[PDB]
Amino acid sequence: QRIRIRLKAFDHRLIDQATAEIVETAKRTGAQVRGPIPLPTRKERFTVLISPHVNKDARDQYEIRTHLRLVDIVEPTEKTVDALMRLDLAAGVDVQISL
Amino acid sequence: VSMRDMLKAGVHFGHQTRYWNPKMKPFIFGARNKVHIINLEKTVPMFNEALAELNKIASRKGKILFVGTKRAASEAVKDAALSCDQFFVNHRWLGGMLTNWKTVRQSIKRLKDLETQSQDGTFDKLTKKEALMRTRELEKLENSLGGIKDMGGLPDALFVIDADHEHIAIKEANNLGIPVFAIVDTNSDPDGVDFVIPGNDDAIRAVTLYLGAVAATVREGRSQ
Amino acid sequence: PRRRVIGQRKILPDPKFGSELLAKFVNILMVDGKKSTAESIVYSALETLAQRSGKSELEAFEVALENVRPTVEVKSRRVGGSTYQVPVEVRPVRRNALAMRWIVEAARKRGDKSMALRLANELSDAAENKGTAVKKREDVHRMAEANKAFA
Amino acid sequence: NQYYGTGRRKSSAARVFIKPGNGKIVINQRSLEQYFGRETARMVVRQPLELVDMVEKLDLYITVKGGGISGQAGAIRHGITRALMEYDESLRSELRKAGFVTRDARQVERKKVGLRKARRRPQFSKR
Amino acid sequence: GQKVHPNGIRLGIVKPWNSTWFANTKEFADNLDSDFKVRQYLTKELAKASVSRIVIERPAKSIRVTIHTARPGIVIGKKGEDVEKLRKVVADIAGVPAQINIAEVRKPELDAKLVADSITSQLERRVMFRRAMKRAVQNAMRLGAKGIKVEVSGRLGGAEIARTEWYREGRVPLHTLRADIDYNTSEAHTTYGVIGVKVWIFKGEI
RNA sequence: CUGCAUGGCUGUCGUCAGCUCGUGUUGUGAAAUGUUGGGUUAAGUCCCGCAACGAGCGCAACCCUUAUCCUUUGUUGCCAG
């Protein structure tokens, strides 16, 4: 069928590096690959009072951006499956596979 | 340089009668058209004598500071100055370049840090304002201190275009015992000048002649 | 406006008649950014005024505006501890704006059933130079002619 | 081949496909009249066909999402002109002067801490 | 006025995060507390090992601590011993299995945290604050800092009225987001209370 | 309990245009000049002028986002033929 990998991480330059790794590996190991597609970034936000007591208008405004990548692999050639499946990827990337 | 050679450039032209400084009576041929005419009989031997002492100074590895900040001649003084491996001041003279050199020296360090960093250190990653804002500073320092940036110490002589315009620089020299060679036009005060060269100090054709001559004799004095 | 002088935004013209002037009018009558509902009231008032009062819709508008237009006014001023009243000759562009503005304000301060009927009857009154809006011009002049000495 | 122009305004974005023949207009599968209940806004989509002349000269087939009434009508205005320029580009000078080429960049301004809105400030009591 | 935290403002720009793992909302809090408990544990046991910085990341079901230290042999101890005993209790605290990495702090006098701690420890020894600061500055510059300042606050020398004082050589553009500004903190618990130390070091731009 | 013993954090004048240093020079000296002036800038911003010449912090720039476009990638987004 197909194997699709969802990649999410807080850092972009680092996420598409992990993406790049996977795609290339696939492309070299003679898999056919749809993607990588940029799936919309879900940015949480936080607003917190900046003073320990009172001064309600004094605040910090933080956000955590969560980046999303879809890697779609058309042919699951076993060499490809082994190629991918012991890649060494950035620790701070969460990798999901659909089967 | 030759009497014939000088006359063509208009070295002999001076300011009006109304603007003269009396001290310069000896070096004026006379006047025509309400304008003072300088004596080229007096100019050349005095000028040649200026070149000789410059030639001597240059031959003991002497450092020569060309000074001329007139807007019209600012570039000519630079090329003249660089053509002989020496140093210049071609825009507004900062008071205390010599007498307060220790402090002005710091600005030189600043200059080098800036062009070095902007090239080898390169940055080009900036904030977008610093590109111009740091260039702004560097741009300014360059005109002010581009010519003495590598002077290292106090100069051994000053060559000056217009003694009145550059009275500040000639006064600092005087205090530091540095000899002053200067083009001293009919309106100016020749007292500050050890070797007085009396001739036009404006006209680019006249200016380039002395300067062209000056830079050439440095190389002869250098070539040994 | 201490230092920065400016131009002025040059609003689009009235959609129906292509008049910048009526665009200055609908906007002045507009409330809570209800443009859609503002021009509806201006037209129906013009339509009420036009239909049953000799037509010439743009001209009818001017006949009324001609009457509430003020030639001079006073500008308050505080000199040597004194609040003097200096009568200033006012410029044409604003002349229209005051004229339009007083017509609109007098319309809402009226007894009739809707703003359109009110607006219509204000224009009519102004057209005959009577009513509140005209009276607003006259107070401006009485107040101006009084301090004529300090111009 | 279709001649195309993208237009957008506020949070709206209108795609605009030009073809010759008629005074037809179909926004989101619907008619111009049907889509916009406001007749003024109807005029703005017509405008790019004023200086540039269509009567029964070309078909514009369009669609749009985002923003509201005037956003969608502004955005379509914008996209047509781009599709007109696509067809010639000589036309522009007219369109420039019209004010129709420009992408109106005025977005709603964000709501800021300590303020009631983007600029409205909490009422200030002296005492 | 109040200044923005110069490490914080530069995160993503020219300064790295010190925690760099990913986690969903479910366990983000738990991870963040676990981080706190390990940093605390290590920071005490290695108090005299000149630990300037602890990086934590969490690959799969793991955690690996990097201890940036100006005294690696101390932290490591004879043939891996001390590393190992740290590992076994980090893994306890962390829940998941654990690995420890050790990165040399080559020039600690350029490390704002070890500068700040060094002054901190010196106030507790009873050194004079002007000396300690001035040794820090001088040191930092002769080693090629573009600039440095160190501040000291509260009850200097046991003074009844609390004071704030700083020294500054060279260049410290805090408004330049490009500027490698290494900023950190330390508190001196003294017989007459707490003396805070702030330190900034400018190391060039981009 | 003491914010009148403190650290850390915060309000505030106020994103107001300020705050300073080296060398030079002036004054017996505290200090001054630089940074007293004419214009102009959001701005000690810039330019002329200038016994000052230069420099550092703050201004601006480098950072996020928004307005046009180009390349890459098309699923869960898209539908011109």
Curated annotation (Swiss-Prot), chain A:
GO BP, sorted A to Z: cytoplasmic translation; regulation of DNA-templated transcription elongation; ribosome biogenesis; transcription antitermination
InterPro entries according to UniProt: Ribosomal_uS10 (IPR001848), Ribosomal_uS10_CS (IPR018268), Ribosomal_uS10_dom (IPR027486), Ribosomal_uS10_dom_sf (IPR036838)
GO terms under cellular component: cytoplasm; cytosol; cytosolic small ribosomal subunit; small ribosomal subunit; transcription elongation factor complex
SUPFAM superfamilies the UniProt entry points to: Ribosomal protein S10 (SSF54999)
An example molecular function term from Gene Ontology annotations: structural constituent of ribosome
UniProt KW keywords: Ribonucleoprotein, Ribosomal protein, Ribosome biogenesis, RNA-binding, Transcription, Transcription antitermination, Transcription regulation
Disulfide bonds: none
Pfam families: Ribosomal_S10
Function as written in the Swiss-Prot or TrEMBL entry: Involved in the binding of tRNA to the ribosomes. Part of the processive rRNA transcription and antitermination complex (rrnTAC). The complex forms an RNA-chaperone ring around the RNA exit tunnel of RNA polymerase (RNAP). It supports rapid transcription and antitermination of rRNA operons, cotranscriptional rRNA folding, and annealing of distal rRNA regions to allow correct ribosome biogenesis. In complex with NusB is involved in the regulation of ribosomal RNA (rRNA) biosynthesis by transcriptional antitermination.
The protein, known as: Small ribosomal subunit protein uS10
Gene, per the UniProt record: rpsJ
UniProtKB/Swiss-Prot annotation, chain B:
GO biological process: cytoplasmic translation; ribosomal small subunit assembly
InterPro entries named among the record's database cross-references: Ribosomal_uS2, Ribosomal_uS2_bac/mit/plastid, Ribosomal_uS2_CS, Ribosomal_uS2_flav_dom_sf
Modified residues (N6-succinyllysine): 112
Gene Ontology CC terms, in alphabetical order: cytoplasm; cytosolic small ribosomal subunit
GO MF entries: structural constituent of ribosome; zinc ion binding
Keywords associated with the record: Ribonucleoprotein, Ribosomal protein
Family stated for the protein in its record: Belongs to the universal ribosomal protein uS2 family.
Function: Required for ribosomal protein bS1 (rpsA) to bind to the 30S subunit.
HAMAP family for this protein: Ribosomal_uS2_B
Description of how the protein assembles with itself and partners: Part of the 30S ribosomal subunit, contacts bS1. Some nascent polypeptide chains are able to cross-link to this protein in situ. In collided ribosomes contacts ribosome rescue factor SmrB.
Protein name per Swiss-Prot or TrEMBL: Small ribosomal subunit protein uS2
Annotated source species: Escherichia coli (strain K12)
From Swiss-Prot, chain D:
Any Pfam family the entry gives: Ribosomal_S9
Assembly notes: Part of the 30S ribosomal subunit. Contacts 16S rRNA. Cross-links to the P site tRNA and weakly to the A site tRNA.
Family label: Belongs to the universal ribosomal protein uS9 family.
Purpose of the protein: The C-terminal tail plays a role in the affinity of the 30S P site for different tRNAs. Mutations that decrease this affinity are suppressed in the 70S ribosome.
Keywords: Ribonucleoprotein, Ribosomal protein, RNA-binding, tRNA-binding
SUPFAM superfamilies assigned to the protein according to its UniProt record, in alphabetical order: Ribosomal protein S5 domain 2-like (SSF54211)
InterPro entries: Ribosomal_Su5_D2-typ_SF, Ribosomal_uS9, Ribosomal_uS9_bac/plastid, Ribosomal_uS9_CS, Ribsml_uS5_D2-typ_fold_subgr
Higher taxonomy: Bacteria, Pseudomonadati, Pseudomonadota, Gammaproteobacteria, Enterobacterales
Chloroplast keyword on record: no
The protein's name: Small ribosomal subunit protein uS9
Record organism: Escherichia coli (strain K12)
UniProtKB/Swiss-Prot annotation, chain E:
Keywords: Ribonucleoprotein, Ribosomal protein, RNA-binding, rRNA-binding
Gene3D superfamilies on file: 3.30.300.20, Ribosomal protein S3, C-terminal domain (3.30.1140.32)
Record-linked SMART domains: KH (SM00322)
Example GO BP: ribosomal small subunit assembly
GO CC, any one term: cytosolic small ribosomal subunit
Sample GO molecular function, one term: rRNA binding
PROSITE patterns: KH_TYPE_2, RIBOSOMAL_S3
InterPro entries: KH_dom (IPR004087), KH_dom-like_a/b (IPR015946), KH_dom_type_2 (IPR004044), KH_sf_prok-type (IPR009019), Ribosomal_S3_C_sf (IPR036419), Ribosomal_uS3_bac-typ (IPR005704), Ribosomal_uS3_C (IPR001351), Ribosomal_uS3_CS (IPR018280)
Ranges where the KH type-2 domain occurs: 38-106
SUPFAM superfamilies in UniProt: Prokaryotic type KH domain (KH-domain type II), Ribosomal protein S3 C-terminal domain
Family: Belongs to the universal ribosomal protein uS3 family.
Function, in words: Binds the lower part of the 30S subunit head. Binds mRNA in the 70S ribosome, positioning it for translation. Plays a role in mRNA unwinding by the ribosome, possibly by forming part of a processivity clamp.
Subunit structure: Part of the 30S ribosomal subunit. Forms a tight complex with proteins uS10 and uS14. With proteins uS4 and uS5 encircles the mRNA as it enters the ribosome, which may play a role in mRNA helicase processivity. Some nascent polypeptide chains are able to cross-link to this protein in situ. In collided ribosomes contacts ribosome rescue factor SmrB.
Alphabetical list of HAMAP family matching this protein: Ribosomal_uS3_B
Name this protein carries in UniProt: Small ribosomal subunit protein uS3
